[PDB]
């Protein structure tokens, strides 16, 4: 059930602006919540919300994604619930913190000219790759011990915050991403999100290139997947890196690591950089 007295945010207390997103539900826009942390300050905020015409189904799956980001709870490394708009009066509302850098593909490329190894300014070095996919690992084993599976883990909703913070959001057919037993059988796990995360580390180590670069999805592609092709390893990865790529990328989900032991993996490496 859900609980209003907690979660509830008036509408006229709320100064929508600039979008950021937009599907076939509806969109995602920034916008400035007023007196949302029980005081009286003014915080930017990202909202869901529904078009005028809306399917009931579209109601339900924004109903159900409120719900889930209240079962979620707070973590670092996960974008974080603020409120909601479900009294009747206006359109229904999923308010989260706001994360002002946008996606980690977008920023990754725009960083490609600024990066080395290590440093013995507005620079990436390896520690910074090394750190988000750490940040990462960490948000998606919380979501797994809430019992949760992302069903889009990819670049595109990692968003970076103020200090250099990760946070796993969703904004809503993704092949690149999706694991053999996705494709073939149509099975959702923790496991196939593995799979995700190992595309996710490319991203990161090709400093967001696209994955299978002028590979043509279908179902070529697919069967090429299934028969244990895999990415070569990308330009700014370390030899453990895609070895770690590799072995979320098991054609078996139970042969794949879980993200507790990506947690230790990738916070031993951090240690190993420096
Ligand atoms: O991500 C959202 N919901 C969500 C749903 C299911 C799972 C998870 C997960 F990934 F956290 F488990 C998160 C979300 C909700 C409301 C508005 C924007 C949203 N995202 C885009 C955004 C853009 C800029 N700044 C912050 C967020």
């Known amino acids: 059930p859900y609980d209003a007295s907690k979660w509830e945010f008036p509408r006229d207390r709320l100064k929508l602006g600039k979008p950021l997103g937009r599907g076939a539900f509806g969109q995602v826009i920034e916008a400035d919540a007023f007196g949302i942390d029980k005081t009286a300050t003014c915080r930017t905020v990202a909202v869901k919300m529904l078009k005028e015409g809306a399917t009931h189904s579209e109601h339900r799956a924004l109903m159900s994604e409120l719900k889930i980001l209240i079962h979620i709870g707070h973590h670092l490394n996960v974008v974080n619930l603020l409120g909601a708009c479900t ?10 913190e706001f994360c002002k850098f946008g996606n980690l593909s977008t920023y990754l490329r725009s960083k490609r000219n600024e990066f080395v190894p290590y440093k013995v300014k507005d620079f990436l070095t390896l520690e910074h790759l090394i750190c988000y996919s750490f940040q990462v690992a960490k948000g998606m084993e919380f979501l797994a011990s809430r019992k949760c599976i992302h069903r889009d883990l990819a670049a595109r909703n990692i968003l970076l915050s ?34 995700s995360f190992g595309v996710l580390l490319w991203e990161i180590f090709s400093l967001g290139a696209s994955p299978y670069p002028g590979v043509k999805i279908d179902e070529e592609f697919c069967r090429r997947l299934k028969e244990g092709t895999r990415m070569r390893a990308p330009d700014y990865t370390t030899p453990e890196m895609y070895q770690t790529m590799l072995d979320c990328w098991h054609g078996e989900p139970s042969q794949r690591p879980t993200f507790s032991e990506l947690v230790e993996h990738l916070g031993n490496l951090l240690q190993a950089n420096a």
């Open 162 to 195: 103020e200090k250099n913070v990760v946070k796993i959001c969703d904004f809503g057919l993704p092949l690149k991403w999706m694991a053999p037993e996705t494709i073939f059988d149509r099975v959702y796990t923790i496991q196939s999100d593995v799979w």
């Open 87 to 96: 009294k009747p009066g206006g359109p229904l509302m999923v308010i989260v």
